[PDB]
Amino acid sequence: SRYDVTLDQSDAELVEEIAWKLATQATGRPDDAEWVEAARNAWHAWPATLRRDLAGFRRDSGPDGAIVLRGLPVDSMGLPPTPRVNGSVQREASLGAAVLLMTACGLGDPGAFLPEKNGALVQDVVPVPGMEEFQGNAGSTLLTFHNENAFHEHRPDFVMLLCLRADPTGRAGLRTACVRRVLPLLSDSTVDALWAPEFRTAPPPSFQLSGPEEAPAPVLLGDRSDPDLRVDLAATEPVTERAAEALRELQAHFDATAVTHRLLPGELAIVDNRVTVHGRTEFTPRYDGTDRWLQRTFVLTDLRRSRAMRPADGYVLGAAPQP
Ligand SMILES: [Cl-]
Ligand SMILES: [Cl-]
Ligand SMILES: [Fe+2]
């Protein structure tokens, strides 16, 4: 399978060397344009085999709309305890930030949203005490299936998750479900419903004090046989009864066809957010610094499209127009 790639020893050693040099020698820090520029240049030093694998995935993300690469460099012996605060982000140069931002520049460009993790390009995904029931990074309850930032016009094209520390408890796993697997299984009425403009996905309160009551829109987008989708099973509200039934059937088939991944250190999951939803199983964190630790970076395949939301042609998307 070209969607599960283990680095051979030589390639893993070359990537480690490149990542260390970037992390230690590049001027500035990960969120600075000059550091992203260094990562972009560093990406082109990677082994050609890996660049070819990623280019292949970008061109065709396959029936599960996801790839896992294994054997990437993480400083396990140097890793501090897993962070325990909401909004934990990687502001300082590190091996993890190097790996993520280099890969981001290979697939497109990294990006982030000002109202989410303060627009940090490399974001920690860790369980936070008191946030157990929360539908987000910090929770440890069941995270229902969603496209990342489904409400947003310039939502991530890819979501990348690098594992620094595995969940020691064995109950946590990333779940990904692709529309390619479910579409041929869906009943005709459900398919019709999903193409109809009968679903409202409002932005979360963090993204606006508020205004424009979101116009109803379809869940399925683009080609009839190979559509994209835009859904959040927590946030998307059906406007009609048939839309409600359709979401229930959609969820059922996501659950039935989802791939569940327990990531290990040095493993990088890349999800095609145009065709694949993700979620996470419930688990019981230890909250003792040994818990699951992933770092996340979003990729925009055509950064240019979001320029109106990126002051100074930066990597942080805000808002506006207005009139
Ligand atoms: Cl490209
Ligand atoms: Cl996992
Ligand atoms: Fe998510």
From Swiss-Prot:
Binding-site list for 2-oxoglutarate: 292
Primary enzyme class: oxidoreductase
Keyword Metal-binding among UniProt keywords: yes
Catalysed reactions listed for this entry: L-asparagine + 2-oxoglutarate + O2 = (2S,3S)-3-hydroxyasparagine + succinate + CO2
SUPFAM superfamilies: Clavaminate synthase-like
GO biological process, alphabetically ordered: antibiotic biosynthetic process
Names of the cofactor(s): Fe(2+)
Keyword Oxidoreductase: yes
Enzyme Commission numbers on file: 1.14.11.39
Functional pathway: Antibiotic biosynthesis; calcium-dependent antibiotic biosynthesis
Source organism, top-level taxon: Bacteria
UniProt keyword list: Antibiotic biosynthesis, Iron, Metal-binding, Oxidoreductase
Mutant phenotype after disruption: S.coelicolor strain A3(2) / MT1110 and A3(2) / 2377 lacking asnO produce non-hydroxylated asparagine-containing CDA variants, which are not synthesized by the wild-types but retain calcium-dependent antimicrobial activity.
GO molecular function: iron ion binding; oxidoreductase activity
Binding site for Fe cation: 146, 148, 278
Entry's family note: Belongs to the clavaminate synthase family.
PANTHER family reported in the protein's UniProt record: GAMMA-BUTYROBETAINE HYDROXYLASE-RELATED, TAUD_TFDA-LIKE DOMAIN-CONTAINING PROTEIN
Name of the featured protein: L-asparagine oxygenase
